[PDB]
Every structure is written in structure tokens, then in C-alpha cells.
Amino acid sequence: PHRFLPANVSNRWNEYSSAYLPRV
Amino acid sequence: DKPKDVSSITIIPKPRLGFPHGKGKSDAVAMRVNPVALTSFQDVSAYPDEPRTTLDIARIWGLRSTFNWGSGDEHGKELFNTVLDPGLRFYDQDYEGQITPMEYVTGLYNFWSGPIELRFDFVSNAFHTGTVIISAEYNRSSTNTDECQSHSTYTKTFHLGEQKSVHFTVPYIYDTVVRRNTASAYLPVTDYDKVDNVSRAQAMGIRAESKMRVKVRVVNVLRPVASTTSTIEVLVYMRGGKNYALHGLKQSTYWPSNSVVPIDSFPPDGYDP
Amino acid sequence: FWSGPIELRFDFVSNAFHTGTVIISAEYNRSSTNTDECQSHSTYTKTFHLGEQKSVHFTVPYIYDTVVRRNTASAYLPVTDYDKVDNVSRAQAMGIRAESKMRVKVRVVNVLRPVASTTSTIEVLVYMRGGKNYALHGLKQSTYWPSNSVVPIDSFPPDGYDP
Amino acid sequence: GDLVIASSEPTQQFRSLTNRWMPINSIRVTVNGKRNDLLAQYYIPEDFLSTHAKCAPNTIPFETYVYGKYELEMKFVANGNKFQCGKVIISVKFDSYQADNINTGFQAALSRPHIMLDLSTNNEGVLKIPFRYHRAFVRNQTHKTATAGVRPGKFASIYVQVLSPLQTGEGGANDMFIRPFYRYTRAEFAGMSYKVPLT
Amino acid sequence: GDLVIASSEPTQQFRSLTNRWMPINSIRVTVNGKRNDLLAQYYIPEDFLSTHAKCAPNTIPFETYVYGKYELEMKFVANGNKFQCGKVIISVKFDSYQADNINTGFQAALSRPHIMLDLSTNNEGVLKIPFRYHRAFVRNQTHKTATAGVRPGKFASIYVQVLSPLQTGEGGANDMFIRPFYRYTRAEFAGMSYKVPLT
Amino acid sequence: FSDGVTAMGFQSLDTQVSIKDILRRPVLLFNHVELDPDYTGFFIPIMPPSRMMQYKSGDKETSFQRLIGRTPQAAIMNLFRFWRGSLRYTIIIHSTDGHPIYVTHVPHTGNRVYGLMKVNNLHEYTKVPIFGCGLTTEMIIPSVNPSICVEVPFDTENNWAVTFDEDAQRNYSWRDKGDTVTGHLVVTPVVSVYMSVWVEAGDDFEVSNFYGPPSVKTNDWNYAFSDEH
């Protein structure tokens, strides 16, 4: 159950948001 | 006419041709209309700045380690001390992090040789001042408190000031023309199996651990102005020398530890939401 | 796979007493609204003044992000007996259909104003062919197959030919 | 090579608009920042169209054209005092779509094309970005009528990362600022259409 | 001559955008229309920016540049049947601001640069418009911050007028249509600024 | 200090530093996997070995070899995200029978699958075989030769094929999802039989788009004695 990321850290296109710097 | 053919020869039949080799001959059948047609690299081709060999990747500078140097560090004190073995970073503990290009690529080979280059970048300003001595020590190692033992080896003293960087070629001085890798040639353990002596006894080989060390000691104590920081970080870069050599392809000692997911059948395996 | 320009030809089935103007437009990536003619006018267009000449040629440019386009039809389809499809069948397909959004449109510029003595409506025939630099690659199962007068062969004369 | 085949019609340049320097958002570096931390990151061209410098005349051709090839140049200007010290690294990752979260460390940055900024000396750095993409063109804009099968406006990623943390003296400033500027060295546009607002 | 003095910085052309044909709104000619009646009129460039063909790529440079010199070409295509007859005249009046209501007849149109359209033959007509203005440049756009002392976006007026009324046969069509198309032969822009929406 | 003299050529002239030479020597993918005639065939996605095929302790069991990720060439391909050209597949059928086993090439259709699959979920494929649909095919006759080496072309729309993604199981834009392969290779038997599959780079082959080394882990030290007992 990891088929898409949570909405807090994502840009519509179901990828890591450019705003969310803490991903690293 | 139908005359007989008397020509003949003895042959040794093999199932594959050039199966082990990376170059030479091949008996590969092209899945094409034209059997001798190939991919065109007229427009789309490899860029000229891209590395062509493993040695080209080893010539890229990579940040190996870091250490702090303060005004409290008395003269003769070891700021830096490591066994410089490109096979393994540690012999007595697990590693996890961003390994340098030359270490990554050396992990693919059973043998290495030639000098190793280091570069020490001092993260400072013009108001920082001091002196350190870099030393390459072979066979016999120095005591932590005995600076004189380090001074008797192959050394380079750097006067920190306006210049905030120094290069250091580590000579290759060993009893053999090449050194074998301290990592394993083959390791079938995949599920973090709890090791015993019987497992070690039935290993692929024996780890010939290096005693060759690079150290950095204080010559003149760091004496910065009151207006700036009393402690600075020093970045230690590493790469293979111009005559760095690698040989004997093996199982890679390093493997990705972050964001590793195996492929599945798309779209059969529940892609249709 | 296919690539290169596609040629069109518009034959107006009319006479000399028919008159009007249309605009042919090739639209890529983004498509126009049905009621917004201005959106169509902003693309690659050719305006044709219908009169004595009753035919116009139009080369559709190849403008895409890839050098070739893959076919929207399947590479292999083992369904022969019109099987009722489900999502599991689609999920285990040969590939995914990359549907094209590239459109060709014809809009009225000047309204058709024929004489009272002739027909008020005319038919326009739209012909199509590959350009001079049309290209094809990657042989696959044919998407089309004969639908009329299809009978499989039998043993002649063993299979009841002798009356 | 692929340009002439991919587009049947000729491509266009607008050097007066695109080849000028344009500043983007300011970057803050603090003493709290650790090595490997992302200070900023940019998916290009997307982020230079619809987030940073949105009213720039550099962005005008992207309104009408659907495709393009893009080579960029990015200048970085730092302003820390002489009693500070630290190292920042800026690097580029080509065709980064769905591969931003891997090979994204300081070590990967040192391998890829990059520039290094010392925070005390205030040396300027200029990284050159060629067009290295798995297709002939990159798509400029998404649209309601356009397909969602291809994610547009991203052929590369830029990362600004801490190499060595910012340090300061007793009663000194606990932060300093860096300003990026961008320009297109070679922006060729293809596939004319009706003008639309950017994202 | 005045170009080099009026603008210290160099002027720019965008031929790919501006020098293409763009259709504007359709014109209806009826049997009710008398001689001297205005079928349509256009204040240029204003009306080609913010009323006619607003989403045209021809209008893109006007968003960013504040000044310009403009030479236009306007093609007219008529479609009346062979049992109709009539005459239409299209003419241009240079620097027409606060002088549209005088010298605005069929006679004045025949004197000024013009084209004549027969509604039965469906002959095409092409009028060429040079830049004849009392200033060096014309202003492209109004703005809230900009002055109201100078009225922008008007260096000329185009008039479409009935010369001889449309006539038809028994049970014939009581109207027919004309379509104008425009293009800039020489559009030089000056004074770069931040992009704005047109009017 | 002196740069010295290189050791290259001293032991032997067999240089193994060339990237292309490393990628051209084979990698086992599938070790004794079953072919079943109830299916269309065993699918092999046309892509080189990489982190995409890496095993992680705990995850679901696949048909893939576990140590693909630890091969030299997999480690090399983890540095380059672009590749163009042909791959070569060595397929060995564990049999000596006279039954023909067909290997069919499928060009880039946009999907990405592996293993046994029923195409369009039918329950009969002997009357409608994939090898007799029109696509390019080659046969193995184990009685003559149980092995074969086939070279698959770069039949795709894209300039480069994408080597890897950050997450191989992520459901993103479907056209982009399939750009990590250039097609498929489908093996179809007559009767139930096992096979083994190797892969290598062709002669006409290039890599590009250097990404540098990723974050890695090792525990090799723990499973070996030192030279001092």
C-alpha cells in the first residue's frame, strides 16, 4: 500500500513537491 | 554432373561462442529485417565529457571524510587518522553513506594499485592561521602522542593562510606490485544472517587488512582573531592517481541502501485503480 | 512506428456558381474549443477561396516531442471470437495506447453564398496519403483484417465437390 | 540532428527576450543548516515559468509554443561577511523526472556538473546547462485538452545544497543570503499555438 | 531616422509571430445598406490586441514592450454569388485620433490609400499601411501607473464603407460576407517592461 | 611526490577497465524458471541489469536472481540513467527434446511486464501463438542446440531508454512509466520445460547521463577472517 505518496509532500502529479525540502 | 565432395575436417562443437569475454567474436542473431543492420549513433551519441572507463570515474574527486581543527588542539595532536584502503572504509563495523567514486568503482575489482590523491579544503577565512603536517605511513604505524614517528615518514607541511586548500599525492609503497581487495569476491548472504565461525571458516577468502595510514597533526596551533570562529571544518577529498589501476572483476562490495523496490508487472499487478 | 508529414486534399463537389471561403488548421498538443475560431487561427493554417478552382492541397506538418510516434493499435491481439472484455483483460494487454491529441479542422471563413438556381449544400471529399518523407518501422500484427466474404479453404475435391 | 526531423516546420529564437539575466527567489543559509540539506531546488523550465519571476519577459514565448529545446546559464551571487565561513554546492541533474530522490547527495553533486561557493570570499559561480533529454523536445505547458500521459516542463533539476555548514564569530550574524540569476543561451521553440496563461 | 534617437537601446522584431496572416471578425453586407454607411471600422493596433483575435500569437510582443513602429498589410476576401452585385471600399486614415468624424465619407476614402471590392466577381484586395504618426513611436498599452495624458494604441483608422448598395435577384440572398486578414510587414518594438494583460 | 609507473600490462594485457567491455559480459537474470504452455509465454522486458532488479530482504519473492544488483555492470548502470543500442540475450532450455521453443521480439508498446502471462486473459494460445502473429521470431531446437544468443534492436520512439526510477512500483503517467524498456522478448514452449536467461550489452551500444554514485551499504567485513586469525 505505497501506490502513491501522501498529499502533504506532493504536487498533483503524485511526486515529491519542490517546496518539501526535508525529503533528503 | 554430380561429382563427390572429398573435402572434410575435424571439428570441436561448442554451444556458445565468446560467452565469457567482453570483446572478440560473437554468434548473436539480429532480430531485424536486415541481419547486418545496427543502431545509428549519427545524431544521438555519448557526450564527450562522459567517462569512458572505470579509471575515468576513479579520477573524479569525492568527499571521503571531514574533521574539525580548533584553537584548543595542542601541537602534535592527531586531527585526522585513518587506514587509507580503497577496498573498505572499516574492517570492524558496518558502513552506510555516500561512498566516493573511486571507492565505489574499486569495489568492483579484486586488485588495485598506483598512487592515491588527497585534497584538504579548509572551510575558513583570511583571519584563520595555523600549520598542519600530512604524513603517509607504511608497514609500521606511529603512536597517537608521538608526533616524531609521523615526521620520520613521507610528509607535507601546509601553512594555512590566504590559501585554504592543499593537494597531497599518497605514494604507492608496498611489497607487491598490486594489492588484493579486502572486500569479498562473492557473498551469498542476502538476509542479514547471524554469522558464526563456521560461516567465516567457509568464506571465499581471507581479508589482508592494510596497515598503511594517512594522518594530519598540528604543527602550529590555530590562532584565529576573536571576531571569527575558533574552530573550522576541513573537507578531505579523495581520488585515484593518474596511474591508478584496477583488475579482476568481482561481486560489488557496495549496493544501494535507499529507495530499493523490485519491479512488478505493469499494468497487471494492481495498477488499474 | 510511423513518422513524417501527412498530405490531405479537399475536393469540393461543386460548380462555378458556388462561392465561399474555409480555413484548414493543423493543431498540436492543445486543441481549440468548437465555438472559438480564434484558437484554430493561431496554429498552422491555409485559407482557401472556393470559386473556379474546386480543390486544395494541404501538407500536415510533423511537429511532435519524439522523432517517431508509436502506433495506437496493438502489436499482438489473440482475441478472435469477440470475447467480452474486462479490466483484467486490459491489465494484461500487450501495451498502453498513447492516444494522439493532434487535430485537423476546417472552419467557415466566409459563408457559402450560391445562386438560387443551384444547390444550397455541397459535399467535400477529404483524401489522405503519406508525405514524400513518410516513414514506417517495426512490423507487427495487422490491426485491420477483411470483414467481407471471408471463407476458409477446404479440400478440393474430397470435401463434397462431386455433386 | 533530431531538431530537423522532430519538427517539419522551422524552429524560432527570441534572444532579446530569453538571453537576458533574470533574478529568481532569494536563498537563506543559516548556522542551523547541516551538510546534504537542500536550501533550494528547481525543476526547469516549469519553476521559472509559473513560480519564480512569473512576470519576466523571458517567459513570453512559452505562452504560444508547445515544444522547445533549452540550454541555460545560472549565475549565483553570495554575500556573507569576512568573519563567517562555509561551503555551498550547486549541481544539475539531467532528465530527473521520477529520479529526484536518488543520486541526490553532496557526493552525487560533486560528480555531476557543478559550481562551489565559499560564503566568506563571495566568489561568483556560473554553471552551464545543456539540453540532455530522452526525447527530441520538452513540452512547455499542460492544458485541459492536452494529454496527461506526458508530464511537461521538466527536462532537468537544479539542487542548492550545504557542503559545509555556515559558521560565525561571537555575536556575529547567524545567516547570510545567496541570489540565483538565470538566462537561456539557446532557446529554440517549435509548434505554434494560441496563447495561454502559464500553469 | 528618428528610431535611433527616440530609443537609446536597440529595437526588436519578431517576424515569426507578427508577420503571419491572422483573420479578424466577419463583416455582413445587406441589401438594406446605403452608400457611405460604415460596415466596420478599426483603430489599430488597439482593436487587433483587445477586441479582434485576442488569443493570436501576433499580440504576444505587445504584452512586454511599451513603444513601437508598425507597418501593416490587410487582405479582404468577399463571397457573393454571380447573380448579386455591389461595390465596397476600404481605406486608411493616418493619425486619426480625434479626427474620425471628419473627412470620413466615400469621397475621402477614394482620395486616401484604398482598395475596391466588387461583390459579384469576388476579387481580393490588399491595402498596405505605412507608419505615419506625429510622434516617433506609438504607445502599445494603457496602465494604472501610466499617464492618461497620451492616448495609446492608435496611430491610424481603417474604414469599410458601402460604395454602391448590394442588390440581388428574385428570391435571391439578401446578404453576403467579407472576411479581413491582417499581418505586420515591419513591427519594431522598443522599451522592454514586465508583461501585462492587453487592456 | 612521484606519480610512478602504472601496473597496467605488467600481469597481463587483458584490460578490464573499459565500461563497454564490462557491460558486454553476461549477467544471469533467471536461474531455472518454468515455461508453461497454458500461457502466451514467459516475458522478458528489454532493459539492462540495474537497481531496478535489486532484491531487498523482506520484500515479495520474484523469479529474478537475487545478486543481480551486486554485479559489476549493474553497479555501472546505476551511474548512467540513459542507454541506447542493442542488448544480447543468451537463453538455455533445460531439455534435449525435438520440440521447438520460439523466442519472439515485441517492439516498444508502452507496457512493462515479466514472467508467465495470459495476454488478454484467455485460456488457449496454441491456435493463436504470439510467434505466428507476424512479429520477428527465432526458434530453439534443444536436440540440436539447447542454447541461443539473440540480439534485440532499439525499436522505440525515444532518443534514449531510461535505465532506472527512484520507485519502480510507483503508479505515475503511464506513457513515461513504459520508457524504461524498449520492448519485450517472449519465450513460448510446446510442453512444460525450464529455462535460464543471461543478458549483456551489444556491440552497437552506448550509455550517457552520468548521475554519480548513490547512497550504499555493505556488511562484507563480518563474513570473513582477517590475516591475523
The 3-state secondary structure of chain F reads CCCCCCCCCCCCCCCCCEHHHHHCCCEEEEEEEEECCCCCEEEEECCCCCHHHCCCCCCCCCCCCHHHCCCHHHHHHCCEEEEEEEEEEEEEECCCCCCCEEEEEEECCCCECCEEECCCCCCCCCCCCHHHCCCCEEEECCCCCCEEEEEECCCCCCCCEECCCCCCCCCCCHHHHHHHCCEEEEEECCCCEEEEEEEEEEEEEEEEEECCCCCEEECCHHHCCECCC
Nearest partner of D4 among E10, C4, F53, judged by Cα: C4
Residue B118 grid coordinates:
588527497
Q: Half-sphere exposure of residue F105, counting CA atoms within 13 Å on the CB side? A: 24
One-character DSSP codes across E65-128: EEEEEEEEEEEEEEE--TT-EEEEEEEEEES-TT-SSSS-SHHHHHHSSEEEEETTTT--EEEE
Residue C43 grid coordinates:
496554429
- CA distances to B119, E89, F44 from B219, rounded to whole Å, are 18, 97, 63
Residue A21 exposed, middle or buried by CB count within 10 Å (0-12, 13-18, 19+) = middle
Residue E17 grid coordinates:
509571430
Sign, CA torsion B13/B15/B21/B25: positive
One-character DSSP codes across chain D: --HHHHBSSPPB--HHHHSS-EE---EEEETTPPTT-EEEEEEEEHHHHHTSSTT-GGGGGGGTEEEEEEEEEEEEEEE--TT-EEEEEEEEEES-TT-SSSS-SHHHHHHSSEEEEETTTT--EEEEE----SSSSEE----SSS-SSS--SEEEEEEEEEEEEEE--TT--SEEEEEEEEEEEEEEEEEE-------
Give buried/exposed letters for B87-115 (b at 16+ CB in 10 A, else e).
bbbeeeeebeebbbbbbbbbbbbbbbbbb
Give the resolution value in Å.
3.9
Please indicate whether, in this complex, the C-beta atoms of E60 and D12 are within 8 angstroms of each other: no
SS3 assignment, position B236: strand
Cα(F70)–Cα(F53) distance, rounded to whole angstroms? 10
- CA distances to D197, E30, E79 from D43, rounded to whole Å, are 19, 57, 52
Please indicate whether, in this complex, the C-beta atoms of D111 and F213 are within 8 angstroms of each other: yes
Residues in Cβ contact with D171 at an 8 Å cutoff, skipping those fewer than 6 apart: none
Output D126-129 pairs: Cβ under 8 A, ≥24 positions apart: D126/D73, D126/D74, D126/D75, D126/D76, D127/D73, D127/D74, D127/D76, D127/D90, D127/D91, D127/D92, D127/D158, D128/D71, D128/D72, D128/D73, D128/D185, D129/D44, D129/D71, D129/D72, D129/D73, D129/D74, D129/D92, D129/D156, D129/D158
Nearest partner of B220 among B78, B120, B80, B75, judged by Cα: B75
Please indicate whether, in this complex, the C-beta atoms of F159 and D134 are within 8 angstroms of each other: yes
Peptide bond into D45 cis (omega under 30): yes
Is residue F71 within 8 Å of residue B251, measured between CB atoms?
yes
Is residue F138 within 8 Å of residue F102, measured between CB atoms?
yes
Residue B118 exposed, middle or buried by CB count within 10 Å (0-12, 13-18, 19+) = buried
Please indicate whether, in this complex, the C-beta atoms of F169 and A3 are within 8 angstroms of each other: yes
- Determine contact: B23 vs chain F, CB below 8 A: yes
- Cα dihedral D147/D153/D156/D162 (nearest 10): -120
Nearest partner of F77 among F54, F100, F44, judged by Cα: F54
Strand partners, C46: C24
Residue D97 grid coordinates:
523526472
The CATH number of the domain covering residues in F19-210:
2.60.120.20
The closest CB to that of D111, out of F164, F179, F210, belongs to F210
- Cα dihedral C134/C138/C140/C142 (nearest 10): 0
- CA distances to B153, C116, C153, E166 from E171, rounded to whole Å, are 115, 7, 64, 14
Please indicate whether, in this complex, the C-beta atoms of F173 and D150 are within 8 angstroms of each other: yes
Give buried/exposed letters for B236-259 (b at 16+ CB in 10 A, else e).
bbbbbbebbbbbbbbbbbbbbebb
Is residue F23 within 8 Å of residue F207, measured between CB atoms?
yes
Cα(B254)–Cα(B90) distance, rounded to whole angstroms? 13
Residue D176 exposed, middle or buried by CB count within 10 Å (0-12, 13-18, 19+) = buried
- Mapping DSSP onto H, E and C, the string for E48-66 reads HHHCCCCCCHHHHHHHCEE
Please indicate whether, in this complex, the C-beta atoms of B121 and D87 are within 8 angstroms of each other: yes
Residue F147 grid coordinates:
542454447
Residues in Cβ contact with E60 at an 8 Å cutoff, skipping those fewer than 6 apart: D60, D61, D63, D64, D195, E14, E17
Is residue B232 within 8 Å of residue B73, measured between CB atoms?
no
- Cα dihedral D121/D122/D123/D128 (nearest 10): 150
One-character DSSP codes across B155-211: EEEEEESS--EEEEEE----SSSSEE-SS-S-----S-----HHHHHTSS--B----
Please indicate whether, in this complex, the C-beta atoms of E56 and C41 are within 8 angstroms of each other: yes
Torsion region of D31: left, alpha or beta (phi above 0 gives left; psi -120 to 50 gives alpha): alpha
Cα(F6)–Cα(F123) distance, rounded to whole angstroms? 63
| CA-angle at B87, arms to B86 and B88, nearest 5° | 95
Please indicate whether, in this complex, the C-beta atoms of F226 and B188 are within 8 angstroms of each other: no
The closest CB to that of B254, out of F178, F207, F216, belongs to F216
| CA-angle at D179, arms to D176 and D185, nearest 5° | 155
Cα(B171)–Cα(B136) distance, rounded to whole angstroms? 8
Strand partners, F139: F102
Cα(B146)–Cα(B77) distance, rounded to whole angstroms? 9
List of chain E residues whose C-beta atoms are within 8 Å of the C-beta of residue C107: none
Domain ranges for chain F, please list them: 19-210
Residue C35 exposed, middle or buried by CB count within 10 Å (0-12, 13-18, 19+) = exposed
List of chain E residues whose C-beta atoms are within 8 Å of the C-beta of residue D61: 60
- DSSP character at residue C60: E
Cα(F8)–Cα(D117) distance, rounded to whole angstroms? 38
- CA distances to E23, E41, E89, E162, E186 from E156, rounded to whole Å, are 19, 11, 17, 20, 15
- CA distances to C82, C152, D86 from C149, rounded to whole Å, are 18, 10, 82
Chains sharing 3 or more CB pairs under 8 A with chain D: A, B, C, E, F
Cα(B191)–Cα(B203) distance, rounded to whole angstroms? 17
Cα(F176)–Cα(F193) distance, rounded to whole angstroms? 35
- Determine contact: C137 vs chain B, CB below 8 A: no
- Determine contact: D94 vs chain F, CB below 8 A: yes
List of chain C residues whose C-beta atoms are within 8 Å of the C-beta of residue F119: 76, 78, 92-94
Nearest partner of F130 among B166, C76, B77, judged by Cα: C76
The closest CB to that of B29, out of F56, F151, F227, belongs to F151
Is residue D38 within 8 Å of residue D160, measured between CB atoms?
yes
Torsion region of F48: left, alpha or beta (phi above 0 gives left; psi -120 to 50 gives alpha): beta
Q: Do chains D and C touch (3 or more CB pairs under 8 A)?
A: yes
Nearest CA in chain D to C27: D193
Domain ranges for chain B, please list them: 1-273
Residues in Cβ contact with C42 at an 8 Å cutoff, skipping those fewer than 6 apart: D64, D192, D193, D194, D195, E22, E53, E55, E56, E57
Cα(B102)–Cα(B100) distance, rounded to whole angstroms? 6
Residue B28 CB neighbours (<10 A): 21
Nearest chain B Cα distance for residue C140, angstroms: 12
Residue F2 grid coordinates:
612521484
- Determine contact: D135 vs chain C, CB below 8 A: yes
Strand partners, B187: none
Q: Rounded to a whole number, what is the distance in angstroms from the first to the last CA of chain C? A: 51
Q: What are phi and psi of F160, to 5 degrees?
A: -125, 150
